[PDB]
Design an enzyme around this catalytic site. Structure first.
Site, PDB file in Angstrom:
ATOM      1  N   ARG A 217       3.062  -0.851   6.660  1.00 36.92           N
ATOM      2  CA  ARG A 217       3.816  -2.059   6.347  1.00 36.92           C
ATOM      3  C   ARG A 217       4.544  -1.905   5.014  1.00 36.92           C
ATOM      4  NH1 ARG A 217      -0.894  -6.465   6.871  1.00 36.92           N
ATOM      5  NH2 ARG A 217      -1.999  -4.671   5.992  1.00 36.92           N
ATOM      6  N   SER A 243       0.968  13.954  -0.136  1.00 36.07           N
ATOM      7  CA  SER A 243       0.347  12.834   0.537  1.00 36.07           C
ATOM      8  C   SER A 243      -1.161  12.770   0.293  1.00 36.07           C
ATOM      9  CB  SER A 243       0.650  12.894   2.029  1.00 36.07           C
ATOM     10  OG  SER A 243       1.957  12.399   2.225  1.00 36.07           O
ATOM     11  N   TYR A 246      -2.574  10.702  -2.518  1.00 34.03           N
ATOM     12  CA  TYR A 246      -2.664   9.274  -2.251  1.00 34.03           C
ATOM     13  C   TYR A 246      -4.016   8.882  -1.587  1.00 34.03           C
ATOM     14  CZ  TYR A 246       2.118   8.553  -3.848  1.00 34.03           C
ATOM     15  OH  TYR A 246       3.253   8.462  -4.618  1.00 34.03           O
ATOM     16  N   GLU A 327      10.577  13.237  -0.622  1.00 27.72           N
ATOM     17  CA  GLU A 327       9.954  12.022  -0.142  1.00 27.72           C
ATOM     18  C   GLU A 327      10.952  11.274   0.716  1.00 27.72           C
ATOM     19  OE1 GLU A 327       9.232   8.844  -3.555  1.00 27.72           O
ATOM     20  OE2 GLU A 327       8.256  10.757  -4.063  1.00 27.72           O
TER      21      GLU A 327
HETATM   22  C1  LIG Z   1       5.274  10.128  -0.740  1.00 32.99           C
HETATM   23  C2  LIG Z   1       4.064  10.108   0.196  1.00 32.99           C
HETATM   24  C3  LIG Z   1       3.202   8.876   0.095  1.00 32.99           C
HETATM   25  C4  LIG Z   1       3.563   7.792  -0.630  1.00 32.99           C
HETATM   26  C5  LIG Z   1       2.739   6.641  -0.721  1.00 32.99           C
HETATM   27  C6  LIG Z   1       3.074   5.500  -1.451  1.00 32.99           C
HETATM   28  C7  LIG Z   1       2.218   4.418  -1.497  1.00 32.99           C
HETATM   29  C8  LIG Z   1       1.009   4.427  -0.805  1.00 32.99           C
HETATM   30  C9  LIG Z   1       0.078   3.243  -0.883  1.00 32.99           C
HETATM   31  N1  LIG Z   1       0.161   2.230   0.171  1.00 32.99           N
HETATM   32  C10 LIG Z   1       1.514   1.649   0.242  1.00 32.99           C
HETATM   33  C11 LIG Z   1       1.596   0.632   1.356  1.00 32.99           C
HETATM   34  N2  LIG Z   1       0.587  -0.414   1.165  1.00 32.99           N
HETATM   35  C12 LIG Z   1       0.768  -1.662   1.787  1.00 32.99           C
HETATM   36  C13 LIG Z   1      -0.299  -2.332   2.384  1.00 32.99           C
HETATM   37  C14 LIG Z   1      -0.095  -3.556   2.986  1.00 32.99           C
HETATM   38  C15 LIG Z   1       1.188  -4.081   2.984  1.00 32.99           C
HETATM   39  C16 LIG Z   1       1.430  -5.421   3.623  1.00 32.99           C
HETATM   40  O1  LIG Z   1       0.509  -6.060   4.125  1.00 32.99           O
HETATM   41  N3  LIG Z   1       2.683  -5.865   3.593  1.00 32.99           N
HETATM   42  C17 LIG Z   1       3.036  -7.174   4.120  1.00 32.99           C
HETATM   43  N4  LIG Z   1       2.234  -3.460   2.415  1.00 32.99           N
HETATM   44  C18 LIG Z   1       2.012  -2.271   1.835  1.00 32.99           C
HETATM   45  C19 LIG Z   1      -0.777   0.105   1.004  1.00 32.99           C
HETATM   46  C20 LIG Z   1      -0.819   1.163  -0.094  1.00 32.99           C
HETATM   47  C21 LIG Z   1       0.660   5.563  -0.076  1.00 32.99           C
HETATM   48  C22 LIG Z   1       1.522   6.653  -0.030  1.00 32.99           C
HETATM   49  N5  LIG Z   1       1.180   7.775   0.699  1.00 32.99           N
HETATM   50  C23 LIG Z   1       1.933   8.895   0.810  1.00 32.99           C
HETATM   51  O2  LIG Z   1       1.530   9.842   1.481  1.00 32.99           O
END
Ligand SMILES: CCc1cc2ccc(CN3CCN(c4ccc(C(=O)NC)nc4)CC3)cc2[nH]c1=O
Length: 350
Positions: A217, A243, A246, A327
């Site tokens: 999301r 990745s 993360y 990315e």
């Molecule tokens: C470049 C590779 C890369 C970048 C990367 C960047 C960030 C995150 C962390 N994530 C981002 C998305 N996040 C969300 C969770 C929930 C919602 C929602 O409910 N929206 C309405 N939106 C976003 C959870 C944490 C993981 C990543 N993993 C990668 O492999």
């Protein structure tokens, strides 16, 4: 007693573990006495994002520390943190805001997982692993170690670990083929778009019940756009280690989860430095952050019609870029079709 394969049962236990969710909240210095897991709500998180947007507005306008104190304090009121009887750290800069926006994003996935555990039915006669598996609305199968797709997946892991991420090495424990209900139907307008690539997406173990349930999301409209390098989209990498960072694994928790997703990139908007965009330029379907190193383009192969950039890292020929590695970002959740989930063992060399 569950008839699901043992790797699938171990995956379900891991992603629905309540003590791991509490651990993730303690890591964020959240006060579990004032705000336990059960009292975490989308409404409160959304209000905290709105305060982060107010803080970021004051930082971009050169507000003094005394001027920003009231705004910073407002965030801590909404998301209580454990600082005893001391003043919390002041949120007076872009880095501070970005760190809190990243925490709230993770809180949204943890709330989804906890909401699945609380919002159903109680039946002692059923195995809890089977009950929790059905809540994900995702078909999960074990990919055979000797299959053609496993060999390609293992090669992608083996070839794209960057030299600058050499504090650990990776071992693939299990490969799962995943099919989120309704996702293939959602992906239809993009299923024949050009530049469809199989890319990585790593996340903390505590996000995977939310990811399998709701998919990848984008941060909500309330989130500050400046808290994300290329704005609010879904981020992917072509280097497994970029990745895997993360996953936030450690010596005291060395098992992580990483996705392989088919991403419809189409016409990429190529960028070398931060661009806090709200929308893509006309005719563009994604952003590609240009890295100095790229998987060897000559070693690209095809897995079910999707390009797999599993070549070893070489110079892209791109000068003056803030990114070591590529990315990819999409700004429509329908442009992603999750294909695999990998369970990795991180062997730390430090
Ligand atoms: C470049 C590779 C890369 C970048 C990367 C960047 C960030 C995150 C962390 N994530 C981002 C998305 N996040 C969300 C969770 C929930 C919602 C929602 O409910 N929206 C309405 N939106 C976003 C959870 C944490 C993981 C990543 N993993 C990668 O492999």
């Amino acid at each position: 007693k569950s008839k699901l394969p043992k790797p699938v049962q171990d995956l379900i236990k891991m992603i629905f573990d309540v003590e791991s969710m509490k651990k993730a909240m303690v890591e964020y210095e959240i006060d579990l006495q004032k705000m336990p897991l059960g009292k975490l709500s989308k409404r409160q998180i959304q209000a905290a994002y709105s305060i982060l947007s107010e803080v970021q507005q004051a930082v971009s306008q050169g507000s003094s520390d005394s001027q920003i104190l009231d705004l910073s304090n407002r965030f801590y009121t909404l998301i209580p943190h454990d600082f005893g009887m001391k003043k919390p750290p002041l949120l007076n800069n872009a880095d501070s805001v970005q760190a809190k926006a990243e925490m709230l994003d993770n809180l949204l996935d943890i709330e989804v997982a906890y909401s699945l555990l609380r919002g159903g039915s109680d039946d002692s006669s059923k195995d809890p692993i089977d009950v929790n598996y059905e809540k994900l609305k995702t078909d999960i199968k074990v990919v055979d170690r000797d299959s053609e797709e496993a060999e390609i997946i293992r090669k992608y892991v083996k070839n794209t670990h960057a030299t600058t991420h050499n504090a650990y090495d990776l071992e693939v424990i299990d490969i799962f083929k995943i099919e989120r209900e309704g996702e293939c139907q959602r992906y239809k307008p993009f299923k024949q778009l050009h530049n469809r690539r199989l890319l990585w997406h790593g996340s903390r173990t505590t996000n995977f019940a939310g990811i399998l349930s709701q998919g990848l999301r984008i941060a909500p409209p309330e989130a500050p756009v400046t808290g994300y390098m290329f704005g609010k989209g879904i981020y992917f990498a072509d280097m497994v280690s970029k990745s895997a960072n993360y996953c936030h694994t450690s010596q005291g928790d060395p098992i992580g989860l990483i996705l392989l997703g088919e991403v419809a990139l189409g016409n990429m908007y190529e960028l070398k430095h931060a661009s806090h965009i709200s929308k893509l330029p006309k005719g563009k379907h994604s952003v590609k952050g240009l890295g100095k190193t790229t998987p060897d383009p000559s070693a690209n192969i095809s897995l079910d019609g999707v390009d797999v950039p599993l070549g070893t890292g070489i110079s892209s020929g791109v000068n003056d870029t803030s990114l070591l590695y590529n990315e990819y970002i999409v700004y429509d959740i329908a442009q992603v079709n999750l294909k695999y989930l990998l369970k990795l063992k991180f062997n730390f060399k430090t």
